[PDB]
GROMACS .gro file of N, CA and C in nm:
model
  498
    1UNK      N    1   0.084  -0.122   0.000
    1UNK     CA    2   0.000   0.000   0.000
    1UNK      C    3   0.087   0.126   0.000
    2UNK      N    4   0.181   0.130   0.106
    2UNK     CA    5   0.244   0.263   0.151
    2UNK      C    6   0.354   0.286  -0.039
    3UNK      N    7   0.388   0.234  -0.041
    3UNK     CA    8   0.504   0.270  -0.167
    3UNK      C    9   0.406   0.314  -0.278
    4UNK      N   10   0.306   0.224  -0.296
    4UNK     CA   11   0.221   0.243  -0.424
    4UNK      C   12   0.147   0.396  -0.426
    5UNK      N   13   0.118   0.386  -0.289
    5UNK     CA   14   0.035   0.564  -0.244
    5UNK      C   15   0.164   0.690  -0.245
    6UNK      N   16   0.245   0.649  -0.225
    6UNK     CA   17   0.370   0.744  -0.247
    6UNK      C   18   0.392   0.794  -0.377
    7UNK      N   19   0.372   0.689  -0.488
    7UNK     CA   20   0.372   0.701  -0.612
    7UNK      C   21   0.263   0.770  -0.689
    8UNK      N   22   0.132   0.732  -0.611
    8UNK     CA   23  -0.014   0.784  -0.696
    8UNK      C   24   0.007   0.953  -0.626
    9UNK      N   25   0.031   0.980  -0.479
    9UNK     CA   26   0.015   1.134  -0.412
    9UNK      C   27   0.097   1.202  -0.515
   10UNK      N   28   0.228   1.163  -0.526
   10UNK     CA   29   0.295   1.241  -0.587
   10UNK      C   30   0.278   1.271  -0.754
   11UNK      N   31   0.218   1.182  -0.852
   11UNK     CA   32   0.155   1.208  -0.968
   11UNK      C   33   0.018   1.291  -0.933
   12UNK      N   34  -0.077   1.286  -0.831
   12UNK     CA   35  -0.181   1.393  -0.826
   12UNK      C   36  -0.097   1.519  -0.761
   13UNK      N   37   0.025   1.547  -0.748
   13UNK     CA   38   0.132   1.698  -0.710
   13UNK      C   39   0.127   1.696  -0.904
   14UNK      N   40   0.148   1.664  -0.910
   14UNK     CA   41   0.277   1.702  -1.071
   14UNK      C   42   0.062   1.699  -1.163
   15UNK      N   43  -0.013   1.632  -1.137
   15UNK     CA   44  -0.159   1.613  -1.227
   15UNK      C   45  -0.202   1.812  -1.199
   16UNK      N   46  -0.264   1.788  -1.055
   16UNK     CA   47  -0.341   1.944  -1.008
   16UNK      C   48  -0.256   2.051  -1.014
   17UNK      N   49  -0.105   1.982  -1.002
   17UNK     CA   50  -0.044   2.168  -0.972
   17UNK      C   51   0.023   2.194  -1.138
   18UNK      N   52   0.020   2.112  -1.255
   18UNK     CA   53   0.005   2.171  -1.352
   18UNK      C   54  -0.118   2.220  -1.437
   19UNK      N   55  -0.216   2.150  -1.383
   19UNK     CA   56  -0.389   2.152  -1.431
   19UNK      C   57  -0.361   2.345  -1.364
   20UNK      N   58  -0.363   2.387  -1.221
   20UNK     CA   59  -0.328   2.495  -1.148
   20UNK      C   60  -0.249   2.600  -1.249
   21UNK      N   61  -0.160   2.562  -1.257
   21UNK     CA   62  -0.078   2.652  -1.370
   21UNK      C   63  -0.086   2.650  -1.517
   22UNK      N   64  -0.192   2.590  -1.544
   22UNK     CA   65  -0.239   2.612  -1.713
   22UNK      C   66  -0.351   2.694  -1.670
   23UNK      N   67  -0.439   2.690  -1.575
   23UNK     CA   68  -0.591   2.753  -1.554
   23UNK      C   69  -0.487   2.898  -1.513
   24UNK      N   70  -0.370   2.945  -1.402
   24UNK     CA   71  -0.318   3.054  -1.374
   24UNK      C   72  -0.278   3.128  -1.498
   25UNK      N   73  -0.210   3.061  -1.577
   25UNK     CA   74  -0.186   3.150  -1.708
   25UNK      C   75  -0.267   3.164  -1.795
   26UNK      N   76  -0.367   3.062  -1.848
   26UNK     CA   77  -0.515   3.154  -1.893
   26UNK      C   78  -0.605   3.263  -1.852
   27UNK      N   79  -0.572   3.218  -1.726
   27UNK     CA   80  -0.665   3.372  -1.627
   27UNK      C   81  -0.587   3.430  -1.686
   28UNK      N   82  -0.439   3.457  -1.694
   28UNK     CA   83  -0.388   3.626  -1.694
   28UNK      C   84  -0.221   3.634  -1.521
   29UNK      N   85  -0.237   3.484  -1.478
   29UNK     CA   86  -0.124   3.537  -1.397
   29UNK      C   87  -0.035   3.475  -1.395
   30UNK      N   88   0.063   3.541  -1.496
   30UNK     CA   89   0.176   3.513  -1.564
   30UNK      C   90   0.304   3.517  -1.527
   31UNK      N   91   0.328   3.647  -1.414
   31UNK     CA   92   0.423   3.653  -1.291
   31UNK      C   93   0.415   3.615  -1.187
   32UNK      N   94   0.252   3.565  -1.135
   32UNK     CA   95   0.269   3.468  -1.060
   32UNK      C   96   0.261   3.324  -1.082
   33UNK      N   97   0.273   3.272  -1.226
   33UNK     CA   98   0.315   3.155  -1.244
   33UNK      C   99   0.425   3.162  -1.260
   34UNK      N  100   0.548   3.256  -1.272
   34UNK     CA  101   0.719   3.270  -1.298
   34UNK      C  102   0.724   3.253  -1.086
   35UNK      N  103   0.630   3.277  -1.042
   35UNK     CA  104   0.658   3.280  -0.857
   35UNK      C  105   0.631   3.163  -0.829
   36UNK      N  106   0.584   3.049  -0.920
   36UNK     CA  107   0.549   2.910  -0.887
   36UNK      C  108   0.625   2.864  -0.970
   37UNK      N  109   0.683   2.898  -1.084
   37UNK     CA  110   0.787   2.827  -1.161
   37UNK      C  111   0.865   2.754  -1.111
   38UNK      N  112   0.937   2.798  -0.982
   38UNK     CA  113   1.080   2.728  -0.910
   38UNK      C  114   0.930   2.577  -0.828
   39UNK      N  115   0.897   2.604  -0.793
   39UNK     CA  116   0.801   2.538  -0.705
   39UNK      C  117   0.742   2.395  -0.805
   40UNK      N  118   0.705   2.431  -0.907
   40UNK     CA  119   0.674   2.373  -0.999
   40UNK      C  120   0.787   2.259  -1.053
   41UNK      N  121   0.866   2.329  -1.137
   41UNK     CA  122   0.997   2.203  -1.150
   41UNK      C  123   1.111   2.170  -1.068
   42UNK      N  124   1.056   2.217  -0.957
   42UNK     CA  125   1.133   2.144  -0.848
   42UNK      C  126   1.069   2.021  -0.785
   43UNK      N  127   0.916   2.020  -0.807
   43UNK     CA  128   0.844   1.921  -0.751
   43UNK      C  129   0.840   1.834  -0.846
   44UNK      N  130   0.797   1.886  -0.965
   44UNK     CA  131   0.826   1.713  -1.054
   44UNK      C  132   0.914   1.669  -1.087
   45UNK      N  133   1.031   1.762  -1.089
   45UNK     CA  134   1.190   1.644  -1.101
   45UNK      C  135   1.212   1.574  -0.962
   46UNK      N  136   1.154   1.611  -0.857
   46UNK     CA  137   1.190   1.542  -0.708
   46UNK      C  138   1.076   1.462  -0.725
   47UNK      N  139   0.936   1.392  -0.820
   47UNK     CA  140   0.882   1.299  -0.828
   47UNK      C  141   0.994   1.242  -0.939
   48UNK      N  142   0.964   1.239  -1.079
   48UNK     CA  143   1.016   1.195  -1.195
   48UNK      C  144   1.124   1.092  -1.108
   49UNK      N  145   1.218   1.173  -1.048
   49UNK     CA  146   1.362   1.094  -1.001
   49UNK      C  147   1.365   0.975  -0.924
   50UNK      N  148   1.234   0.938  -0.931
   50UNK     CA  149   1.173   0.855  -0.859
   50UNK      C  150   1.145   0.738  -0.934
   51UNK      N  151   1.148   0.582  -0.932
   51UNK     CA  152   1.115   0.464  -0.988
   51UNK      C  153   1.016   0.419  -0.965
   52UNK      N  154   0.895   0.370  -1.001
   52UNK     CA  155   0.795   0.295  -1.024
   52UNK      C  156   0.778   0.144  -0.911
   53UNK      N  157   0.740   0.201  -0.791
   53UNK     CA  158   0.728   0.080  -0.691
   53UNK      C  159   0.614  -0.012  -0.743
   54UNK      N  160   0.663  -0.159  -0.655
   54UNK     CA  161   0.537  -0.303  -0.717
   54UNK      C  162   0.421  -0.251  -0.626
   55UNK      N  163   0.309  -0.344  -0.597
   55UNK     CA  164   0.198  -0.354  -0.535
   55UNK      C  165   0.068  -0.322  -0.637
   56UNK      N  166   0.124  -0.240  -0.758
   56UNK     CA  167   0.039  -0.177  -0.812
   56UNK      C  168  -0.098  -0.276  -0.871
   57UNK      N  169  -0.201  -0.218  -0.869
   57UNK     CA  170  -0.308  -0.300  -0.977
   57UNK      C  171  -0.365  -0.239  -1.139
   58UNK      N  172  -0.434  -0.336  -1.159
   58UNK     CA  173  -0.507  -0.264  -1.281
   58UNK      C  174  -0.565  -0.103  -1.283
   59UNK      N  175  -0.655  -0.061  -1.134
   59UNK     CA  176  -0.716   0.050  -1.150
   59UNK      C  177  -0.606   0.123  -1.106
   60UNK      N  178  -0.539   0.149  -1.021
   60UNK     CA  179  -0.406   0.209  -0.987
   60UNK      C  180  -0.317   0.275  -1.138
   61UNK      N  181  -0.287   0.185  -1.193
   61UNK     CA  182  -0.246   0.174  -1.329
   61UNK      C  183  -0.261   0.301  -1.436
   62UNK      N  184  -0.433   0.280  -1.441
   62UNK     CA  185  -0.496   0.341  -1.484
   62UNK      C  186  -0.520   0.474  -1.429
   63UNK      N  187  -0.555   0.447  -1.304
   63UNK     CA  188  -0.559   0.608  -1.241
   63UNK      C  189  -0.429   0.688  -1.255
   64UNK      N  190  -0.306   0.617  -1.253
   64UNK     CA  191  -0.192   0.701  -1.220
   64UNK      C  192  -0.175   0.739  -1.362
   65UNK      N  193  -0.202   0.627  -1.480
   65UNK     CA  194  -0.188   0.657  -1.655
   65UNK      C  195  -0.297   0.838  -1.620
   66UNK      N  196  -0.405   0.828  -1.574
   66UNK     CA  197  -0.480   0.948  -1.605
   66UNK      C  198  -0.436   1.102  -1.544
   67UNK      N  199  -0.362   1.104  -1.418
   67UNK     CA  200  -0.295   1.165  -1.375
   67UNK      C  201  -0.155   1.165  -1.446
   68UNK      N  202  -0.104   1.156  -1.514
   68UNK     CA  203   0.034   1.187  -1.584
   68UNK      C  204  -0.023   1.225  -1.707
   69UNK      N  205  -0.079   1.181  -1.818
   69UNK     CA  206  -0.177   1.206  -1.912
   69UNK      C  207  -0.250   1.376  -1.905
   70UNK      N  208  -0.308   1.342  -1.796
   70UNK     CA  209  -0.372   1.512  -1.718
   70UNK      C  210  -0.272   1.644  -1.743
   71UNK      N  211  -0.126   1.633  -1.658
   71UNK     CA  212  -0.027   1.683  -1.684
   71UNK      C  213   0.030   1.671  -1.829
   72UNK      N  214  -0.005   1.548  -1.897
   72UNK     CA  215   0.060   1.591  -2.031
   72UNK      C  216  -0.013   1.686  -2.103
   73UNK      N  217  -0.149   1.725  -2.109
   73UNK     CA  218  -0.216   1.788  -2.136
   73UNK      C  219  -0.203   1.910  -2.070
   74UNK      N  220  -0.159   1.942  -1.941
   74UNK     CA  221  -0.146   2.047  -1.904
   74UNK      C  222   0.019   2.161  -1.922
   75UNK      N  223   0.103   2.034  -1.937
   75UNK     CA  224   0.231   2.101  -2.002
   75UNK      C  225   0.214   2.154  -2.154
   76UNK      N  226   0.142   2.039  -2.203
   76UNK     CA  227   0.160   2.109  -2.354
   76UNK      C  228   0.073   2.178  -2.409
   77UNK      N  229  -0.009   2.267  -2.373
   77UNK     CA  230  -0.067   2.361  -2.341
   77UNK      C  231  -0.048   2.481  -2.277
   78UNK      N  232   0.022   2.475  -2.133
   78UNK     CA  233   0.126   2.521  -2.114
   78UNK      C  234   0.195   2.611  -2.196
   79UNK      N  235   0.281   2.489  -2.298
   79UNK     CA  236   0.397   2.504  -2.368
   79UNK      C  237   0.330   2.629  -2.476
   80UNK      N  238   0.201   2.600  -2.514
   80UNK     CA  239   0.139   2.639  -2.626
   80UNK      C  240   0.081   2.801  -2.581
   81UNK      N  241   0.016   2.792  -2.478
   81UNK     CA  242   0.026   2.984  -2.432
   81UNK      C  243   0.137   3.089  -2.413
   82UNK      N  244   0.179   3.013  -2.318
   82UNK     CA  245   0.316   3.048  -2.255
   82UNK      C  246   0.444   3.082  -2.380
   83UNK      N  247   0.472   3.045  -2.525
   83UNK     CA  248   0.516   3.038  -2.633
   83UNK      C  249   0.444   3.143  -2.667
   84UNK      N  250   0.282   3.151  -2.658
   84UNK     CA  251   0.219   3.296  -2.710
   84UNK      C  252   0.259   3.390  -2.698
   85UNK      N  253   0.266   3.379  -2.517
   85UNK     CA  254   0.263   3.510  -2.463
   85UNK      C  255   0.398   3.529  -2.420
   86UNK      N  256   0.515   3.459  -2.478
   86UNK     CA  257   0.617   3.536  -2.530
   86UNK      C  258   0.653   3.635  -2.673
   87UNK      N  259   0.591   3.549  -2.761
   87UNK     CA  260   0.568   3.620  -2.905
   87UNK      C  261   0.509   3.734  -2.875
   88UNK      N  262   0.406   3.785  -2.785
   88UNK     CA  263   0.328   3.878  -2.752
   88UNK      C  264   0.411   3.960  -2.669
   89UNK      N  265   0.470   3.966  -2.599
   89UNK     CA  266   0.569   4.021  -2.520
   89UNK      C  267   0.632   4.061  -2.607
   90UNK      N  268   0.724   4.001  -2.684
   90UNK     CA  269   0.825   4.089  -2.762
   90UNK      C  270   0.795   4.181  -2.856
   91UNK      N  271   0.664   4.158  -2.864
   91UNK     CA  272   0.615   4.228  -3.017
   91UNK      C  273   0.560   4.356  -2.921
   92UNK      N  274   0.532   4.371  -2.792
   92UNK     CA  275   0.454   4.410  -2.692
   92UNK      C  276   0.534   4.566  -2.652
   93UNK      N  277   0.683   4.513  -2.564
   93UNK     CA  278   0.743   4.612  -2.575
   93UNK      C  279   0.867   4.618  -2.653
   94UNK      N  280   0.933   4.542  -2.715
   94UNK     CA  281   1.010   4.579  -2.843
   94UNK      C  282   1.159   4.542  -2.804
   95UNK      N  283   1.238   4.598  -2.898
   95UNK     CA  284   1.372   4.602  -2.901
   95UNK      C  285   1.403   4.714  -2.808
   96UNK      N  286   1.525   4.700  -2.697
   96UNK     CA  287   1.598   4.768  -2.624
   96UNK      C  288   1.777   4.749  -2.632
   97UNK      N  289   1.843   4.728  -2.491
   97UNK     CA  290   1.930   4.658  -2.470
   97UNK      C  291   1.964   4.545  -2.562
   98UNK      N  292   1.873   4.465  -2.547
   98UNK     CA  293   1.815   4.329  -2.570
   98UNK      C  294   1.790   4.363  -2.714
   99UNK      N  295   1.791   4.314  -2.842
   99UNK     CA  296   1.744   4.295  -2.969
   99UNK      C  297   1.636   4.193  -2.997
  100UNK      N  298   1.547   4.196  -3.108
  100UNK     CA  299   1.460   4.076  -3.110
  100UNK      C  300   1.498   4.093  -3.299
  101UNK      N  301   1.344   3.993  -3.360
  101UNK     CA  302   1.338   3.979  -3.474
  101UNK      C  303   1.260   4.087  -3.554
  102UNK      N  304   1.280   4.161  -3.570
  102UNK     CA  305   1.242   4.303  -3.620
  102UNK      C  306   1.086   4.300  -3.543
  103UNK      N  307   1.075   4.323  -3.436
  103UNK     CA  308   0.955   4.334  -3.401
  103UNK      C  309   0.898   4.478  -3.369
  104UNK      N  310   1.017   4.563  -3.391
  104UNK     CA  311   1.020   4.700  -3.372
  104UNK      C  312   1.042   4.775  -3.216
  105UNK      N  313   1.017   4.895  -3.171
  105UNK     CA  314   1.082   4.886  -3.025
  105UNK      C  315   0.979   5.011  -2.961
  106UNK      N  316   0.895   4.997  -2.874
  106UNK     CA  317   0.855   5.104  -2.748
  106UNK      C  318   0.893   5.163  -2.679
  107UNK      N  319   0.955   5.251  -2.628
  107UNK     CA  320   1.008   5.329  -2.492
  107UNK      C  321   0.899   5.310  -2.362
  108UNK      N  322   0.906   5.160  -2.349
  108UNK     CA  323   0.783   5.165  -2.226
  108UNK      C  324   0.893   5.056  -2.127
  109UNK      N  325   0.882   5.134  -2.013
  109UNK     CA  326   0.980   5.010  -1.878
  109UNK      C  327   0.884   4.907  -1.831
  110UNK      N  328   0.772   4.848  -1.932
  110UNK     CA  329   0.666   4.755  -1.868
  110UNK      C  330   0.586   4.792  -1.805
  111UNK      N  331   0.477   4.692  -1.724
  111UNK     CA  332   0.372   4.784  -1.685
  111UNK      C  333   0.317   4.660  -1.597
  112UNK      N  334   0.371   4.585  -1.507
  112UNK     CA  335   0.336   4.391  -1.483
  112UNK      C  336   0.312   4.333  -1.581
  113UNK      N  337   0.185   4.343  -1.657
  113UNK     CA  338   0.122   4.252  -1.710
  113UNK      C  339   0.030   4.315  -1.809
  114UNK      N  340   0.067   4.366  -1.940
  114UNK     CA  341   0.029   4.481  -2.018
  114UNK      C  342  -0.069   4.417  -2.133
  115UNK      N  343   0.011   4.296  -2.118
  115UNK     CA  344  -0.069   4.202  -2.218
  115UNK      C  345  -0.130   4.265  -2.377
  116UNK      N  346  -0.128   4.108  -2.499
  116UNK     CA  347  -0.104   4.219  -2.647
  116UNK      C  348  -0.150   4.101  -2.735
  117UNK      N  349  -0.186   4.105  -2.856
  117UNK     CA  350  -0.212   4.022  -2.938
  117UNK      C  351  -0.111   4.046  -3.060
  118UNK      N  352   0.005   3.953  -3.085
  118UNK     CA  353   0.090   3.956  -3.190
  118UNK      C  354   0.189   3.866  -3.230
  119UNK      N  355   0.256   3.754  -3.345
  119UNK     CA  356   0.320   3.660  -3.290
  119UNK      C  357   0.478   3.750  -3.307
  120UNK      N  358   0.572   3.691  -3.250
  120UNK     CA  359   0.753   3.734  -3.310
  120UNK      C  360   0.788   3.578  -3.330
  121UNK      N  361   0.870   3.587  -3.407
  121UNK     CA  362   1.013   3.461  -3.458
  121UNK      C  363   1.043   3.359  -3.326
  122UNK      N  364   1.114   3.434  -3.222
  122UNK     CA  365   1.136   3.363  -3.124
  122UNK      C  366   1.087   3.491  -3.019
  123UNK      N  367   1.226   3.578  -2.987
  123UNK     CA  368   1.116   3.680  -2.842
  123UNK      C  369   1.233   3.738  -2.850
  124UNK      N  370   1.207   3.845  -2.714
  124UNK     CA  371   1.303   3.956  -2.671
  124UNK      C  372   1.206   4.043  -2.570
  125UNK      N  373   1.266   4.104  -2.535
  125UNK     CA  374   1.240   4.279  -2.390
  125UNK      C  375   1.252   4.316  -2.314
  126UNK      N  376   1.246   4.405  -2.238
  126UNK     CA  377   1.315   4.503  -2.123
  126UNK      C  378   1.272   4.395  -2.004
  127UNK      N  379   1.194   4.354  -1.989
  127UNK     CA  380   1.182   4.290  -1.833
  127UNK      C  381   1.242   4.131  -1.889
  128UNK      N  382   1.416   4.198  -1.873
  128UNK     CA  383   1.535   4.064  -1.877
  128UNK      C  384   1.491   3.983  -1.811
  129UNK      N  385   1.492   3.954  -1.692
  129UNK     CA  386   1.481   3.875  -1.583
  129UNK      C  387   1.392   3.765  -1.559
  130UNK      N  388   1.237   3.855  -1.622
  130UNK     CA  389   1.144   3.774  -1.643
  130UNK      C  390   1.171   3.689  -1.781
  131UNK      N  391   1.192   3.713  -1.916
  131UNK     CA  392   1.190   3.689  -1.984
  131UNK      C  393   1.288   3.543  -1.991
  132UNK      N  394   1.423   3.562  -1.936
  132UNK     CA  395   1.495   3.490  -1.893
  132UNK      C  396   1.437   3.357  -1.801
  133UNK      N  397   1.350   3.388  -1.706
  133UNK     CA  398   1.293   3.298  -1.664
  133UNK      C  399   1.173   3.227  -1.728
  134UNK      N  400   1.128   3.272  -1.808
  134UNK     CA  401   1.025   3.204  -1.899
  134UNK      C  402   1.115   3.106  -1.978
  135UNK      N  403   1.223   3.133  -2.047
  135UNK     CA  404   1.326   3.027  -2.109
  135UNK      C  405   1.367   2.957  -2.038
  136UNK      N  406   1.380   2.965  -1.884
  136UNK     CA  407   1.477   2.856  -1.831
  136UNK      C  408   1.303   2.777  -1.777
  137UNK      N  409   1.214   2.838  -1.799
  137UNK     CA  410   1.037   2.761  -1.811
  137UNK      C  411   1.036   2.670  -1.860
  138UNK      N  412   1.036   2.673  -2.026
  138UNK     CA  413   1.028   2.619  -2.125
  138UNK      C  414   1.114   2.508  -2.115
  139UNK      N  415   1.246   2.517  -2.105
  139UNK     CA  416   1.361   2.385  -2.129
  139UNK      C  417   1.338   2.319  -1.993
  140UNK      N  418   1.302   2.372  -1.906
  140UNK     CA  419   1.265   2.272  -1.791
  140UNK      C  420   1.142   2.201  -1.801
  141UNK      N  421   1.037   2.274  -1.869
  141UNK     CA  422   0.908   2.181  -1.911
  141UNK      C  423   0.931   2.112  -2.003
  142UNK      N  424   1.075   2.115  -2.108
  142UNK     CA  425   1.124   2.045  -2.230
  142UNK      C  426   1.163   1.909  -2.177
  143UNK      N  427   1.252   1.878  -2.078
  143UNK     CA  428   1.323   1.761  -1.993
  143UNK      C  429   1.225   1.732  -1.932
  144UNK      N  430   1.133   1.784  -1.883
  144UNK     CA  431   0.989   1.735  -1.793
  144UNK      C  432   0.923   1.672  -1.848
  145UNK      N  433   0.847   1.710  -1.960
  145UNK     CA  434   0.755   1.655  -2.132
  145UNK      C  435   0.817   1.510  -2.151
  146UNK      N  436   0.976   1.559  -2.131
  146UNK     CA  437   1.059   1.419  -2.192
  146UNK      C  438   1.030   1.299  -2.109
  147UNK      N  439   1.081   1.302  -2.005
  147UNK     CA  440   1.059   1.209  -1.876
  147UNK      C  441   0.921   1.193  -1.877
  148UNK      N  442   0.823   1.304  -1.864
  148UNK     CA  443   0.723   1.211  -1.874
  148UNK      C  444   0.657   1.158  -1.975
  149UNK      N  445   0.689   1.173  -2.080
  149UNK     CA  446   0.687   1.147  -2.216
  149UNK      C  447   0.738   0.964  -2.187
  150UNK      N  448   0.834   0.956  -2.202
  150UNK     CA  449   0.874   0.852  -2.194
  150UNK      C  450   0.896   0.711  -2.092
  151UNK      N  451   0.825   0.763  -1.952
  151UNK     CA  452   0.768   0.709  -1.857
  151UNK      C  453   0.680   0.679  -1.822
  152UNK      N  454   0.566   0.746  -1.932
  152UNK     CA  455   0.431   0.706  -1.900
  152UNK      C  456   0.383   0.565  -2.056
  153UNK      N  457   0.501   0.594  -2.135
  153UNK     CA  458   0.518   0.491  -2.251
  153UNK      C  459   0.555   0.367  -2.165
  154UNK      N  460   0.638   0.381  -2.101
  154UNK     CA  461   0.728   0.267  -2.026
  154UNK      C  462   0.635   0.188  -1.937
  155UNK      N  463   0.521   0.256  -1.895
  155UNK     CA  464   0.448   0.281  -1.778
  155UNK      C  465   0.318   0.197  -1.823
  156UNK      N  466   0.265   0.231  -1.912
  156UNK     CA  467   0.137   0.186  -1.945
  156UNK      C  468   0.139   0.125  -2.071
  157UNK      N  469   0.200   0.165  -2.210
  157UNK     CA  470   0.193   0.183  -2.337
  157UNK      C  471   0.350   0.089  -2.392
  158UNK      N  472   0.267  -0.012  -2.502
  158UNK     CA  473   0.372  -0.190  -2.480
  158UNK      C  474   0.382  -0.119  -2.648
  159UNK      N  475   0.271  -0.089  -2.731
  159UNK     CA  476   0.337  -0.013  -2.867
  159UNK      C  477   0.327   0.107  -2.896
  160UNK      N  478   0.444   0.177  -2.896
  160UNK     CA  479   0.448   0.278  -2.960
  160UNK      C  480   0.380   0.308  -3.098
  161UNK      N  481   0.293   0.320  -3.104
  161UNK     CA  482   0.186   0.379  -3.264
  161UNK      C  483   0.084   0.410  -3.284
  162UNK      N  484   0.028   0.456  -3.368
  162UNK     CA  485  -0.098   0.502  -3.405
  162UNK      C  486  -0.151   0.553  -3.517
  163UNK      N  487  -0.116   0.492  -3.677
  163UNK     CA  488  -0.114   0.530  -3.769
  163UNK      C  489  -0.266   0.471  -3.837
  164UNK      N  490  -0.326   0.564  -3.805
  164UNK     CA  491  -0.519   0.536  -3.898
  164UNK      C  492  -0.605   0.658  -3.907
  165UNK      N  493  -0.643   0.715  -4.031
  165UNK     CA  494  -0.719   0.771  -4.057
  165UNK      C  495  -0.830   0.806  -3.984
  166UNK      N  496  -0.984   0.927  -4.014
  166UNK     CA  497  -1.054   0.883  -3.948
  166UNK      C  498  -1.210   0.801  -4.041
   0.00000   0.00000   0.00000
């Protein structure tokens, strides 16, 4: 019981608190998901690093497949705003210090959360720090995706495929 429940608690941490941070950055709170960022991939690499204890059953299985699944859906989604609302950012307040892909440049020092509809190439802008931390976001949800990408194959899923029309 005890090992197997160690395994399911900690996939419903890494299921709700990314379900949590896809619903936070759709609302609109974008610096306070960069204030849960550290919180965030610190908790699922201290699950991930973790091996797959016995006891388990069929519904277990399944429940824990739906909770990692949950999170895959919630990273790559995630991946898919969060990618927006960098393109939007750079196009937002512009070239400074910092250069982007001709996205052109504002004289504005930010504003929190100014928010914009526009895509850029890759990104760039004045709030370094943040911006910086949205990239070290991304490649940590990149190695995260991976692991669980490939642990929940290991985990539940005997062939890799799915090639059929509809």
């Amino acid at each position: 019981m005890t090992s197997t429940v160690e395994f399911i608690n900690r996939w419903q941490r890494i299921a709700l608190l990314s379900q949590s941070l896809l619903e936070l950055a759709q609302r609109g709170e974008w610096d306070l998901l960069l204030q849960q960022e550290v919180s965030y991939l610190q908790s699922i690499e201290t699950v991930m690093e973790k091996q797959t204890p016995p006891g388990i059953t069929r519904s277990i299985q399944d429940m824990v497949a739906g909770y990692i699944k949950q999170t895959l859906d919630n990273e790559q989604l995630l991946k898919g705003l969060l990618q927006q609302r960098l393109d939007e950012l750079s196009s937002l307040i512009g070239q400074v210090l910092f250069q982007g892909p001709s996205a052109g440049l504002v004289p504005r020092g930010s504003g929190g959360i100014e928010g914009s509809n526009l895509n850029t190439d890759m990104g760039n802008g004045i709030a370094s720090n943040r911006w910086i931390n949205y990239q070290q976001f991304i490649q940590t949800l990149e190695k995260a995706i991976e692991q669980h990408r490939l642990q929940l194959t290991q985990w539940t899923q005997k062939v890799d495929l799915a090639l059929k029309s509809w």
